[PDB]
């Protein structure tokens, strides 16, 4: 009949997502273990926590 009817709604779909994490300054000391020079004894393998 004559009148105004509401059917559905519309939303502006979002664009490409954005991920923003803080500056990476701290790092593991992996350079001094994998690129090391001399190792410990076999029966005293180290546990570098």
């Amino acid at each position, epitope marked *: 009949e004559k009148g105004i009817y509401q059917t559905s709604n519309f939303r502006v779909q979002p664009t490409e997502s954005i991920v923003r994490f803080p500056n990476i300054t701290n790092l593991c000391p992996f350079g001094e273990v994998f690129n090391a020079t*001399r*190792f410990a004894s076999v029966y*005293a393998w180290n546990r570098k926590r």
Partner: nanobody
Amino acid sequence: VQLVESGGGLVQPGGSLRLSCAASDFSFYDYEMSWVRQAPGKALEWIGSMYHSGRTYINPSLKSLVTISRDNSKNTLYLQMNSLRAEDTAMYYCVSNWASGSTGDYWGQGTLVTVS
């Protein structure tokens, strides 16, 4: 000082030299003593290894050439080298716990072994 070394200077081939390696206490003697060399270009070569359990295991071609004596008053080690060669010509170190890496060890003042 917790760990130190003594003796050295110039070593006469064939003769006997009473080298020393003093310290402050026996409680710091875990787990090894060693008198080693780091020659330029040569790989790791260890000439001595005095162990915490009163053991000295050396290369079979060297332990006959080396005399062993351990003290506890000054906690010094007595070791004698004869028929010296130029392959030992380096900053001869007394490294306590040589196999424990370069953090649980002390590097001594050093000396030289030269053949005229």
